Design a protein around this ligand. Structure first.
Ligand code: NI
Lengths: 38, 37, 37, 38
């Protein structure tokens, strides 16, 4: 629980996973931008 | 400042900052996409 | 798989993956900037 | 040394710092792109 080493690492891992999903979405937006230029 | 608890709270803070950056980058990309049509 | 060592090696691996993504995003942005002139 | 909990956390913190610097550079590139469109 919000204090514990295991809990902190759990939050960190979840957050990093969320960063990865946002970066996949950012990459997709960039693909769209590149494709719409030709 | 070199304890496990101290290191972990810096890492969590920095990862949170990274998410803030990601939200701004996402907004900028929405602006760019919409500006193109 | 729930040990501190196991958690930390997943976190380090994921953070490394994030850097790979960042390098690709950077390349794409260089392409876009240069395509504009 | 590459094994230790403190060492692993040191690598993780350094890497996250590097991610932050890359994301600042990405943001700058996006600012340039937006500005060159008007
Ligand atoms: Ni354009």
């Amino acid at each position: 629980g919000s204090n514990t080493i295991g809990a902190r690492l759990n939050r960190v891992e979840d957050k990093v996973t969320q960063l990865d999903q946002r970066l996949a979405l950012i990459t997709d937006m960039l693909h769209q931008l590149l494709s719409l230029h030709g």
